[PDB]
Amino acid sequence: HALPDFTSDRYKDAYSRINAIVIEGEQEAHDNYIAIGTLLPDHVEELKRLAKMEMRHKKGFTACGKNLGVKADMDFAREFFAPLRDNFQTALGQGKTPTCLLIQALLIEAFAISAYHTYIPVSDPFARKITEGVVKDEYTHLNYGEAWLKANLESCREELLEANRENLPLIRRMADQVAGDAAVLQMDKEDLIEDFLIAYQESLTEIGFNTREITRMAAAAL
Ligand SMILES: CCOCCOCCOCCCCCCCCCCC=O
Ligand SMILES: [Fe+3]
Ligand SMILES: [Fe+3]
Predict the structure, then answer these.
(1) What are the residue ranges spanned by the domains of the chain?
(2) What is the DSSP letter of 210?
(3) What is the DSSP annotation of 15-64?
(4) For 58, which of 67, 155, 191, 212 is 20 to 30 Å away at the CA?
């Protein structure tokens, strides 16, 4: 806390959707951290700094698409995120800070970390430097969210178990929907799943969940 042919129509086609998802994910991260600031007004300056970070990342990932001569399929990306975006919006409107934090700071960050770690060894030299820069910049020891959830665990255990039950399957469906395009990019779905589960288990351990609790939570993916 072998390399694909980056110039082929097959590669560019799959990249148009993967690149769009990463770009949209970064925009949504910016919007979510600002929204979280309305729930945690004393966290506004840290959340503004984290939102500026994600926008820097959005620009770097936009340049990855441009460098390969690929037009990002933004409509596909907006639809890909719509279920999780809807649940974040519902929790936000209800003032459900633990749900908002689990979605953004835990699920989405672990999803991003796994994607970046899996992509790095199979990426083009331009995108590799951008992605490595993004991982060597997803940072505090604990996120605004480990740290707030670690500090507030006793008041929000049941909501966290509910948020996980509702949102972890959405993350699994997202991984299923993009597995084909990820394989075109020479990424193995099993590596993505393994890295996500490890990153998510690490965050849950840090927050104060025990092994049995984590096992039951990870099982909600099915
Ligand atoms: C239940 C296992 O779920 C496995 C999910 O594995 C991750 C597969 O994701 C590959 C698609 C790439 C999407 C990257 C998301 C970018 C979000 C960046 C937002 C920054 O906080
Ligand atoms: Fe990011
Ligand atoms: Fe992030």
Answers:
(1) 8-222
(2) -
(3) HHHHHHHHHHHHHHHHHHHHHHHHH-GGGHHHHHHHHHHHHHHHHHHHHH
(4) 191
Q: Is the CB of 196 under 6 A from ligand 1?
A: yes
Ligand 1 atom closest to Cα of residue 221: 1
Give me the resolution in angstroms, 1 decimal.
Answer: 2.1
Neighbours of 108 (CB within 10 A): 23
Experimental approach taken: X-ray
Give the orientation angle of helix 189-207 with respect to helix 211-219, to 10 degrees: 140
What element of type H or E holds 212? Answer: helix 211-219
CA separation for the pair 208, 5 (Å, rounded) = 44
Does 158 appear as a known binding residue?
Answer: no
Is 26 annotated to bind a ligand? Reply is yes
CA of 169 to the centre of ligand 3 (A): 20
Q: Of all protein residues, whose CA lies closest to atom 3 belonging to ligand 1?
A: 172
- Give the residue, out of 27, 192, 200, with the most ligand 1 atoms within 8 A of its beta carbon, to mutate for a pocket test: 192
Q: Which residue has the tokens 């995120």?
A: 81
**Which residues have C-beta within 8 Å of that of residue 80, sequence separation ≥ 6?**
21, 24, 174, 177, 178
